[PDB]
Ligand binder design. Sequence first.
Ligand SMILES: C[C@@H]1O[C@@H](O)[C@@H](O)[C@H](O)[C@@H]1O
Ligand SMILES: C[C@@H]1O[C@@H](O)[C@@H](O)[C@H](O)[C@@H]1O
Ligand SMILES: C[C@@H]1O[C@@H](O)[C@@H](O)[C@H](O)[C@@H]1O
Ligand SMILES: C[C@@H]1O[C@@H](O)[C@@H](O)[C@H](O)[C@@H]1O
Ligand SMILES: [Ca+2]
Ligand SMILES: [Ca+2]
Ligand SMILES: [Ca+2]
Ligand SMILES: [Ca+2]
Ligand SMILES: [Ca+2]
Ligand SMILES: [Ca+2]
Ligand SMILES: [Ca+2]
Ligand SMILES: [Ca+2]
Lengths: 114, 114, 114, 114
Amino acid sequence: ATQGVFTLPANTRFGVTAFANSSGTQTVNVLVNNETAATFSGQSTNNAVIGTQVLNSGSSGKVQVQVSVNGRPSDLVSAQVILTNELNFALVGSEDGTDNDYNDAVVVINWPLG
Amino acid sequence: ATQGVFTLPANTRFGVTAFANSSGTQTVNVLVNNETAATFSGQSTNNAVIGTQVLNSGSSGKVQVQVSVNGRPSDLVSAQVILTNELNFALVGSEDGTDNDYNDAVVVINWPLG
Amino acid sequence: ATQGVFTLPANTRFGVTAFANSSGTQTVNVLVNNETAATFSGQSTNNAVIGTQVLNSGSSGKVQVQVSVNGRPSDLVSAQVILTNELNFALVGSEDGTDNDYNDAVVVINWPLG
Amino acid sequence: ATQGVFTLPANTRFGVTAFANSSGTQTVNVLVNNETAATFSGQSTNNAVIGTQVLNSGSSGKVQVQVSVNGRPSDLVSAQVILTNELNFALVGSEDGTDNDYNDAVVVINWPLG
Ligand SMILES: C[C@@H]1O[C@@H](O)[C@@H](O)[C@H](O)[C@@H]1O
Ligand SMILES: C[C@@H]1O[C@@H](O)[C@@H](O)[C@H](O)[C@@H]1O
Ligand SMILES: C[C@@H]1O[C@@H](O)[C@@H](O)[C@H](O)[C@@H]1O
Ligand SMILES: C[C@@H]1O[C@@H](O)[C@@H](O)[C@H](O)[C@@H]1O
Ligand SMILES: [Ca+2]
Ligand SMILES: [Ca+2]
Ligand SMILES: [Ca+2]
Ligand SMILES: [Ca+2]
Ligand SMILES: [Ca+2]
Ligand SMILES: [Ca+2]
Ligand SMILES: [Ca+2]
Ligand SMILES: [Ca+2]
């Protein structure tokens, strides 16, 4: 199944934050309406924040997260959760190796803001 | 129901990260086994990452998030989600006012790390 | 925070299914647009299905689950989860007593159908 | 990532319930410790409950959901959610065709019971 793709309400600000947990340098690309809107890159085995940004979901509301390590695409796992019918989280884990911890880059998208 | 309380794996590192979306200054406390282990604070209406920290869940694994604004506890909402039977997120929203957006402080706990 | 209230896409059919795990008879009301659209009742300590139906979210998309036992509303917990950006679950637990298992009536809403 | 595999607490009763939404007859097998413990089959485009049963997670706690149509495995998507640190749902969708509604068989596992 496709992972790392989310439909947000149109024309809405959202937060995106990425964390790293791997020996490999993580590259996280965030695409809005199929065009790169943010790219984060860093290396940590201690959950360091490697980027945070506020983006607009645009007319389509389509947001996609991709993760790679030195050009090799990581396998993704994702879901969306909504609390009290108001607070949205789109969550992504990724695996760059063999241990299947899926934390090598972790990406959290949240909306609405403000 | 009780909200903002999670049973983590014992003795395990976790990340805790807080975001602010309110006119009021947020104060987020993270309790491990009922003692304060981290405190974050800030004021943003654009999802500022007012704190992020790596903590250990301790012998009991009990982790609790509390949020206050203007010296008054915020109402909390929370859930935990597990992806691919391994990757965990404990999610908290909080409301300091009347609009019930529940994003005034948002807290994400993630494990495993490394 | 309010629980058991979900905004579905408008005019979209959904499944609703209730399970019982309690000494007491559970009465589950499912509201669409703030009117009762279905009512299920039964008693089980073995997770019996006490009702299942297809309903339409209608023009507002507003769906609410209420649970009563022994003449009083049960305390509710809920969340929505979306898998592969396609499959939606709105999930409700409820507590009629003191043990806080929150399974006394469990309600699962899923969409889309067909 | 692997989907449809969950680790439950050992020696614990859980509910498993399957719904169908497809022109094809769905076959759902629920494995506990790698042995089939329940099987449901049926065709519906109206979210019929093609089966619901109480199982025991046994010594291993390992529960796997498999979905097929006439022996051809469907593609799975899954996650687990925990409400109020107590109430657990393991969720599975499946896709037997090309439209990616992922509702062709939907399986919900819930615990605790009673
Ligand atoms: C230090 C290790 O680095 C890579 O091998 C990751 O895939 C592992 O999960 C671990 O983080
Ligand atoms: C700017 C406003 O500040 C407080 O009133 C919050 O409770 C509102 O949600 C909004 O963020
Ligand atoms: C058999 C018992 O019945 C009621 O007391 C429920 O609140 C309990 O959770 C348990 O199901
Ligand atoms: C009626 C159709 O039957 C199969 O083609 C399913 O894959 C479709 O999702 C739809 O349910
Ligand atoms: Ca890894
Ligand atoms: Ca890792
Ligand atoms: Ca607010
Ligand atoms: Ca706010
Ligand atoms: Ca109870
Ligand atoms: Ca009960
Ligand atoms: Ca399908
Ligand atoms: Ca279908």
